[PDB]
Amino acid sequence: HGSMGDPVSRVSQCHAEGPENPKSAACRAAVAAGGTQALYDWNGIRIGNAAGKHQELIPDGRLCSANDPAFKGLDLARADWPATGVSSGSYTFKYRVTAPHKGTFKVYLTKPGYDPSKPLGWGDLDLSAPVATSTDPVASGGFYTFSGTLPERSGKHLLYAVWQRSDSPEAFYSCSDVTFG
Ligand SMILES: [Cu+2]
Ligand code: NA
Structure with missing residues (x-):
């Protein structure tokens, strides 16, 4: 259980605003569409x-x-x-982990041309070239820390992190909104 901490996941960012009266239009829309309970369960996006x-x-x-x-x-x-806000180059990912598990993280970045005003699909992600991968990182202080590389991009993008357990078929999913502008 967990979610991305740096760059913060969309669910954790809405939680941090105060789920009962969010600050941003986007998180207010999320709560009108799907309720506040989701934000309290920020660590529980799983299959x-x-x-x-x-x-x-x-x-x-x-x-x-x-x-x-x-x-x-x-x-x-x-x-x-x-x-x-992010920049191209080496990047240190921080994944906020509330219940550690053996397994692998893969982090994918949206392709150039990404349009956030359209639904996110697998086709929007560069799945062939994950920006980061980490197998069995060591939890410390409520985080996994692992490095990767953000490639060249120009404006609004999204990182999609998949955490597949190795001791279990369970996986966890995180989307994080970023901008290179
Ligand atoms: Cu868990
Ligand atoms: Na976005």
Whole structure:
């Protein structure tokens, strides 16, 4: 259980605003669409029986909720999700982990031309060249820390992190909004 901490996941960012009266238009829309409970369960975007079949199990437009209706407010195609500013180059990812598990993280970045006003699909992600991978990182202080590389990009983008357990078919999913502008 967990979610991306740096760059902060969309679910954790809405939680940090105060789920009962969010600050941003985007998080207010997420709560009107899917309720406040999702934000308290920020560490629980999961598929119990994924077994590496992410693209088979998760429809386009359902990546940020992992096709769980509880999290459907996170699927909105907003141009205005609050975003972490990033730059191309080496990057130290921090994944906020509330329950450690053996397994592998892969982090994918949207392709050039990404339009956040359209639903997120697998086709929008560069799945052939993950920006980071980490197998069995060591939890410390409530985080996994692992490095990768953000490639050259120009404007609004999204990072999609898949955490597949190795002792279990369960996986966890995180989308983080970023901008290179
Ligand atoms: Cu867990
Ligand atoms: Na975005």
